Design an enzyme around this catalytic site. Sequence first.
Site, PDB file in Angstrom:
ATOM      1  N   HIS A 116       0.822  -1.198   0.000  1.00 20.17           N
ATOM      2  CA  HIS A 116       0.000   0.000   0.000  1.00 20.17           C
ATOM      3  C   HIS A 116       0.859   1.252   0.000  1.00 20.17           C
ATOM      4  O   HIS A 116       0.395   2.305  -0.432  1.00 20.17           O
ATOM      5  CB  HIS A 116      -0.990   0.017   1.186  1.00 20.17           C
ATOM      6  CG  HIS A 116      -0.405   0.527   2.472  1.00 20.17           C
ATOM      7  ND1 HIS A 116       0.053  -0.316   3.458  1.00 20.17           N
ATOM      8  CD2 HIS A 116      -0.192   1.790   2.929  1.00 20.17           C
ATOM      9  CE1 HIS A 116       0.530   0.398   4.465  1.00 20.17           C
ATOM     10  NE2 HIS A 116       0.398   1.679   4.166  1.00 20.17           N
ATOM     11  N   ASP A 165      -0.575  -7.374   1.910  1.00 15.95           N
ATOM     12  CA  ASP A 165       0.040  -6.050   1.908  1.00 15.95           C
ATOM     13  C   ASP A 165       1.544  -6.219   2.076  1.00 15.95           C
ATOM     14  O   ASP A 165       2.113  -6.016   3.154  1.00 15.95           O
ATOM     15  CB  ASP A 165      -0.551  -5.196   3.026  1.00 15.95           C
ATOM     16  CG  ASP A 165      -0.171  -3.722   2.927  1.00 15.95           C
ATOM     17  OD1 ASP A 165       0.373  -3.304   1.883  1.00 15.95           O
ATOM     18  OD2 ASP A 165      -0.473  -2.962   3.889  1.00 15.95           O
ATOM     19  N   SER A 266       4.073   3.050   7.700  1.00 18.83           N
ATOM     20  CA  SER A 266       3.735   2.057   6.676  1.00 18.83           C
ATOM     21  C   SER A 266       4.972   1.410   6.085  1.00 18.83           C
ATOM     22  O   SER A 266       5.919   2.103   5.713  1.00 18.83           O
ATOM     23  CB  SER A 266       2.961   2.725   5.533  1.00 18.83           C
ATOM     24  OG  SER A 266       1.670   3.132   5.903  1.00 18.83           O
TER      25      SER A 266
HETATM   26  C1  LIG Z   1     -11.892   0.917   5.572  1.00 17.14           C
HETATM   27  C2  LIG Z   1     -11.780   1.578   6.874  1.00 17.14           C
HETATM   28  C3  LIG Z   1     -10.457   2.115   7.317  1.00 17.14           C
HETATM   29  C4  LIG Z   1     -10.276   3.472   7.483  1.00 17.14           C
HETATM   30  C5  LIG Z   1      -9.055   3.981   7.922  1.00 17.14           C
HETATM   31  C6  LIG Z   1      -7.958   3.121   8.195  1.00 17.14           C
HETATM   32  N1  LIG Z   1      -6.745   3.693   8.687  1.00 17.14           N
HETATM   33  C7  LIG Z   1      -5.451   3.204   8.722  1.00 17.14           C
HETATM   34  O1  LIG Z   1      -5.185   2.118   8.214  1.00 17.14           O
HETATM   35  C8  LIG Z   1      -4.363   4.111   9.420  1.00 17.14           C
HETATM   36  N2  LIG Z   1      -2.968   3.777   9.091  1.00 17.14           N
HETATM   37  C9  LIG Z   1      -2.216   4.102   7.889  1.00 17.14           C
HETATM   38  N3  LIG Z   1      -2.800   4.824   6.849  1.00 17.14           N
HETATM   39  N4  LIG Z   1      -0.942   3.638   7.914  1.00 17.14           N
HETATM   40  C10 LIG Z   1      -0.880   2.990   9.178  1.00 17.14           C
HETATM   41  C11 LIG Z   1       0.173   2.353   9.728  1.00 17.14           C
HETATM   42  C12 LIG Z   1       0.023   1.803  10.959  1.00 17.14           C
HETATM   43  C13 LIG Z   1      -1.152   1.878  11.654  1.00 17.14           C
HETATM   44  C14 LIG Z   1      -2.224   2.529  11.129  1.00 17.14           C
HETATM   45  C15 LIG Z   1      -2.064   3.075   9.889  1.00 17.14           C
HETATM   46  N5  LIG Z   1      -8.105   1.753   8.079  1.00 17.14           N
HETATM   47  C16 LIG Z   1      -9.321   1.304   7.637  1.00 17.14           C
END
Ligand SMILES: CCc1ccc(NC(=O)Cn2c(N)nc3ccccc32)nc1
Length: 319
Positions: A116, A165, A266
């Site tokens: 991702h 992922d 990430s």
């Molecule tokens: C479909 C619903 C939905 C909405 C928002 C998110 N939010 C994330 O996954 C946050 N997040 C990111 N972007 N890198 C990370 C790295 C590590 C931890 C969290 C992290 N998940 C699912």
Amino acid sequence: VDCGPPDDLPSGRVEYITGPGVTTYKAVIQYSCEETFYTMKVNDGKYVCEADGFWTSSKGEKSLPVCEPVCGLSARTIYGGQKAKPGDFPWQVLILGGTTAAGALLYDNWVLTAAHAVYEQKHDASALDIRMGTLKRLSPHYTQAWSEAVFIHEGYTHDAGFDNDIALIKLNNKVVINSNITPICLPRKEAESFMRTDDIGTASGWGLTQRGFLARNLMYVDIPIVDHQKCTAAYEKPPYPRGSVTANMLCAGLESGGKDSCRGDSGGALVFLDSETERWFVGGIVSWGSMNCGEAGQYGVYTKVINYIPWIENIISDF
Ligand SMILES: CCc1ccc(NC(=O)Cn2c(N)nc3ccccc32)nc1
């Protein structure tokens, strides 16, 4: 019967034993690696010229040995974390371009990361700006690398869940392995015994902290693996897709909540100590979690690297 001049050994050297240039039948050469940060694999490096006219080893191999980098060394041996010291995470890689992300060095020319984090830059053919040897995200002093090739897992569907992922980046040049840059080890098969519920992993990154901003300096947290039922349940609720937590994921974090990986972490390696080999290995890749980093009961979700060893090995062995 003259075997000719031997092939050069990457990250190693060759030497004539019998004499300078002696390439005749029964001539003897010696390959060697820089043994501090590399270790020779395959054979002992002793090659004798054979009657068939090809340099050949004590085992009958006609091809080169391999100088494989040492992995998993740490000077110890992100929400709620503390500032890494130099050499704590020598495998840590910063990936810049589209947004801030991270990876982990493998060998001296591969980076393991989350699909991702690199999918969008991959699919418009923009080389990845890869930086390492540096604790400071924004420092102008770092080891530069560029992606030669990016492999996104063939079962990863971008923006449609986080199963599979995982991505591998081939660097266009080997990086120099030293005390500040050292790859992480891949888990051995029995490494699961170090990744049980309540075993402690370490996540490192420049991602969002509890203050809600990216870090300037590399941060890290020790976090326990969470029971998989408990993690599956925490994410069985809107807005999350049905079945967001799969068997290819491991969860890690606190029921309380104050220790977590966040946006910008990430692709970082969730590492664990093989207490018997005394080397760190990558158990997880920072993948997803709740949009509120460090929220109580909403555990970090990590790609489970041990499930992807055939894939990783398939790609690295073939390219
Ligand atoms: C479909 C619903 C939905 C909405 C928002 C998110 N939010 C994330 O996954 C946050 N997040 C990111 N972007 N890198 C990370 C790295 C590590 C931890 C969290 C992290 N998940 C699912």
